[PDB]
Short mmCIF file of all heavy atoms in Angstrom, two decimals:
data_model
loop_
_atom_site.label_atom_id
_atom_site.label_comp_id
_atom_site.label_asym_id
_atom_site.label_seq_id
_atom_site.Cartn_x
_atom_site.Cartn_y
_atom_site.Cartn_z
N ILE A 206 54.20 -80.41 -112.48
CA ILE A 206 53.11 -81.33 -112.21
C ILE A 206 52.97 -81.58 -110.71
O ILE A 206 53.81 -82.25 -110.12
CB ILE A 206 53.32 -82.64 -112.99
CG1 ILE A 206 53.49 -82.34 -114.48
CG2 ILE A 206 52.14 -83.57 -112.74
CD1 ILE A 206 53.55 -83.57 -115.37
N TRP A 207 51.88 -81.04 -110.16
CA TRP A 207 51.44 -81.29 -108.81
C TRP A 207 50.51 -82.50 -108.73
O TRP A 207 49.49 -82.56 -109.41
CB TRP A 207 50.73 -80.04 -108.26
CG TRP A 207 51.68 -78.92 -107.97
CD1 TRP A 207 52.06 -77.93 -108.82
CD2 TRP A 207 52.41 -78.71 -106.74
NE1 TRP A 207 52.97 -77.11 -108.20
CE2 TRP A 207 53.20 -77.56 -106.93
CE3 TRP A 207 52.46 -79.37 -105.51
CZ2 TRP A 207 54.05 -77.05 -105.94
CZ3 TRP A 207 53.30 -78.88 -104.53
CH2 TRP A 207 54.08 -77.72 -104.74
N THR A 208 50.85 -83.42 -107.81
CA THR A 208 49.99 -84.52 -107.41
C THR A 208 49.69 -84.38 -105.92
O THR A 208 50.62 -84.41 -105.13
CB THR A 208 50.69 -85.84 -107.68
OG1 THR A 208 50.98 -85.89 -109.07
CG2 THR A 208 49.87 -87.03 -107.26
N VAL A 209 48.40 -84.28 -105.58
CA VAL A 209 47.94 -84.09 -104.22
C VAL A 209 47.14 -85.31 -103.80
O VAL A 209 46.07 -85.57 -104.33
CB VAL A 209 47.10 -82.81 -104.03
CG1 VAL A 209 46.75 -82.52 -102.58
CG2 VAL A 209 47.81 -81.60 -104.62
N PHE A 210 47.68 -86.08 -102.85
CA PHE A 210 47.00 -87.24 -102.34
C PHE A 210 45.62 -86.83 -101.83
O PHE A 210 45.45 -85.82 -101.18
CB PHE A 210 47.80 -87.88 -101.19
CG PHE A 210 49.04 -88.61 -101.64
CD1 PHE A 210 50.28 -87.97 -101.67
CD2 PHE A 210 48.98 -89.93 -102.03
CE1 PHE A 210 51.41 -88.64 -102.08
CE2 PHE A 210 50.13 -90.61 -102.41
CZ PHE A 210 51.35 -89.96 -102.46
N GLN A 211 44.64 -87.68 -102.09
CA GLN A 211 43.34 -87.48 -101.50
C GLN A 211 43.37 -87.69 -99.99
O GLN A 211 42.79 -86.92 -99.27
CB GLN A 211 42.30 -88.45 -102.02
CG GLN A 211 40.90 -88.09 -101.56
CD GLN A 211 40.12 -89.35 -101.41
OE1 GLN A 211 40.61 -90.29 -100.78
NE2 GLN A 211 38.95 -89.43 -102.04
N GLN A 212 44.01 -88.73 -99.51
CA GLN A 212 43.97 -88.96 -98.08
C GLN A 212 45.07 -88.24 -97.33
O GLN A 212 46.07 -87.88 -97.90
CB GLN A 212 43.90 -90.45 -97.74
CG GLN A 212 44.87 -91.38 -98.39
CD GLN A 212 44.32 -92.78 -98.38
OE1 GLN A 212 45.03 -93.73 -98.12
NE2 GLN A 212 43.03 -92.91 -98.63
N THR A 213 44.86 -88.03 -96.05
CA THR A 213 45.80 -87.27 -95.26
C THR A 213 46.66 -88.21 -94.44
O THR A 213 46.52 -89.43 -94.45
CB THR A 213 45.05 -86.27 -94.39
OG1 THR A 213 44.41 -87.07 -93.41
CG2 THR A 213 44.04 -85.48 -95.20
N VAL A 214 47.56 -87.56 -93.73
CA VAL A 214 48.47 -88.19 -92.79
C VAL A 214 48.27 -87.47 -91.45
O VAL A 214 47.99 -86.27 -91.42
CB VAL A 214 49.82 -87.97 -93.49
CG1 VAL A 214 50.80 -87.16 -92.66
CG2 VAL A 214 50.44 -89.27 -93.98
N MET A 215 48.36 -88.22 -90.35
CA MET A 215 48.03 -87.68 -89.04
C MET A 215 49.27 -87.53 -88.16
O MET A 215 50.12 -88.41 -88.14
CB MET A 215 46.99 -88.58 -88.37
CG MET A 215 45.60 -88.33 -88.92
SD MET A 215 44.39 -89.56 -88.39
CE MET A 215 43.00 -88.43 -88.60
N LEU A 216 49.38 -86.38 -87.50
CA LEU A 216 50.35 -86.13 -86.45
C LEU A 216 49.60 -85.67 -85.20
O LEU A 216 48.62 -84.93 -85.31
CB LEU A 216 51.31 -85.02 -86.89
CG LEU A 216 52.42 -85.36 -87.90
CD1 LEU A 216 51.95 -85.96 -89.21
CD2 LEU A 216 53.17 -84.06 -88.16
N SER A 217 50.14 -86.01 -84.02
CA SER A 217 49.69 -85.50 -82.72
C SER A 217 49.75 -83.98 -82.66
O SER A 217 50.55 -83.36 -83.36
CB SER A 217 50.53 -86.09 -81.59
OG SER A 217 51.77 -85.40 -81.46
N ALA A 218 48.95 -83.39 -81.77
CA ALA A 218 48.95 -81.95 -81.53
C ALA A 218 50.34 -81.49 -81.11
O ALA A 218 50.79 -80.40 -81.48
CB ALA A 218 47.92 -81.61 -80.47
N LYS A 219 51.04 -82.33 -80.35
CA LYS A 219 52.38 -81.99 -79.88
C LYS A 219 53.33 -81.85 -81.08
O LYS A 219 54.07 -80.87 -81.17
CB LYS A 219 52.83 -83.02 -78.84
CG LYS A 219 54.28 -82.91 -78.34
CD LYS A 219 54.56 -81.65 -77.52
CE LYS A 219 53.90 -81.65 -76.16
NZ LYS A 219 54.40 -82.73 -75.31
N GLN A 220 53.31 -82.86 -81.97
CA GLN A 220 54.11 -82.85 -83.20
C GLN A 220 53.83 -81.60 -84.04
O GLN A 220 54.75 -80.87 -84.43
CB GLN A 220 53.81 -84.15 -83.92
CG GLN A 220 54.51 -85.35 -83.30
CD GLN A 220 54.20 -86.61 -84.06
OE1 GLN A 220 53.06 -86.83 -84.48
NE2 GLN A 220 55.21 -87.44 -84.29
N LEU A 221 52.55 -81.31 -84.26
CA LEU A 221 52.20 -80.14 -85.05
C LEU A 221 52.71 -78.87 -84.38
O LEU A 221 53.21 -77.98 -85.08
CB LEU A 221 50.70 -80.10 -85.33
CG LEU A 221 50.23 -81.13 -86.36
CD1 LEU A 221 48.72 -81.21 -86.39
CD2 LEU A 221 50.78 -80.77 -87.74
N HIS A 222 52.60 -78.79 -83.04
CA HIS A 222 53.18 -77.68 -82.29
C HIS A 222 54.71 -77.70 -82.45
O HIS A 222 55.32 -76.69 -82.77
CB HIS A 222 52.68 -77.70 -80.83
CG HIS A 222 52.69 -76.34 -80.21
ND1 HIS A 222 53.70 -75.88 -79.38
CD2 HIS A 222 51.81 -75.33 -80.32
CE1 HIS A 222 53.43 -74.64 -79.01
NE2 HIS A 222 52.29 -74.28 -79.57
N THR A 223 55.35 -78.86 -82.29
CA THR A 223 56.79 -78.93 -82.48
C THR A 223 57.16 -78.39 -83.87
O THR A 223 58.10 -77.60 -83.99
CB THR A 223 57.29 -80.37 -82.28
OG1 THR A 223 56.91 -80.92 -81.01
CG2 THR A 223 58.80 -80.48 -82.46
N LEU A 224 56.41 -78.77 -84.93
CA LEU A 224 56.67 -78.29 -86.29
C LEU A 224 56.58 -76.77 -86.40
O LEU A 224 57.41 -76.14 -87.05
CB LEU A 224 55.71 -78.92 -87.30
CG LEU A 224 55.88 -78.48 -88.77
CD1 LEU A 224 57.31 -78.62 -89.27
CD2 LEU A 224 54.96 -79.33 -89.65
N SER A 225 55.55 -76.18 -85.81
CA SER A 225 55.23 -74.78 -86.06
C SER A 225 55.97 -73.85 -85.11
O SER A 225 56.01 -72.65 -85.34
CB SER A 225 53.74 -74.52 -85.96
OG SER A 225 53.13 -75.31 -84.94
N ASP A 226 56.56 -74.39 -84.04
CA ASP A 226 56.97 -73.52 -82.95
C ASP A 226 58.47 -73.57 -82.69
O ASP A 226 58.92 -72.85 -81.83
CB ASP A 226 56.19 -73.79 -81.67
CG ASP A 226 55.02 -72.85 -81.40
OD1 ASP A 226 54.04 -72.88 -82.19
OD2 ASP A 226 55.12 -72.07 -80.41
N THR A 227 59.24 -74.37 -83.43
CA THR A 227 60.62 -74.61 -83.05
C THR A 227 61.61 -73.82 -83.92
O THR A 227 62.74 -73.59 -83.47
CB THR A 227 60.87 -76.11 -83.07
OG1 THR A 227 59.95 -76.61 -82.10
CG2 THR A 227 62.29 -76.49 -82.71
N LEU A 228 61.21 -73.35 -85.11
CA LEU A 228 62.16 -72.80 -86.06
C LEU A 228 61.99 -71.29 -86.16
O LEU A 228 60.86 -70.80 -86.06
CB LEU A 228 62.07 -73.45 -87.45
CG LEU A 228 62.28 -74.96 -87.50
CD1 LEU A 228 62.02 -75.52 -88.89
CD2 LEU A 228 63.68 -75.33 -87.04
N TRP A 229 63.14 -70.61 -86.39
CA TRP A 229 63.24 -69.16 -86.52
C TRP A 229 63.58 -68.79 -87.96
O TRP A 229 64.38 -69.46 -88.61
CB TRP A 229 64.29 -68.61 -85.54
CG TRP A 229 63.92 -68.75 -84.08
CD1 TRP A 229 64.25 -69.79 -83.26
CD2 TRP A 229 63.13 -67.84 -83.29
NE1 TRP A 229 63.72 -69.59 -82.01
CE2 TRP A 229 63.03 -68.41 -82.00
CE3 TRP A 229 62.50 -66.61 -83.53
CZ2 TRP A 229 62.33 -67.78 -80.96
CZ3 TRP A 229 61.80 -66.00 -82.52
CH2 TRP A 229 61.71 -66.58 -81.25
N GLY A 230 62.97 -67.68 -88.43
CA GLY A 230 63.10 -67.22 -89.81
C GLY A 230 64.02 -66.01 -89.92
O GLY A 230 64.88 -65.79 -89.07
N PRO A 231 63.87 -65.17 -90.98
CA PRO A 231 64.66 -63.94 -91.12
C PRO A 231 64.41 -62.97 -89.97
O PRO A 231 63.33 -62.97 -89.38
CB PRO A 231 64.21 -63.38 -92.49
CG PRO A 231 63.60 -64.57 -93.21
CD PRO A 231 62.93 -65.37 -92.10
N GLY A 232 65.42 -62.13 -89.67
CA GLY A 232 65.36 -61.20 -88.55
C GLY A 232 65.40 -61.95 -87.22
O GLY A 232 66.34 -62.68 -86.95
#
């Protein structure tokens, strides 16, 4: 059972960059 909130949550551009740019995957 998936429940998806209608409203969103906000992060700064810096935070979103920190999220997407800091972690390394396989290889």
Side-chain angles (χ1 to χ4, degrees):
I206 305 186
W207 288 91
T208 301
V209 187
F210 287 94
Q211 190 212 48
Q212 49 203 221
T213 71
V214 120
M215 281 170 155
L216 283 56
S217 80
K219 174 67 70 63
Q220 284 181 319
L221 287 169
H222 207 262
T223 306
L224 179 52
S225 36
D226 261 66
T227 299
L228 302 174
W229 294 92

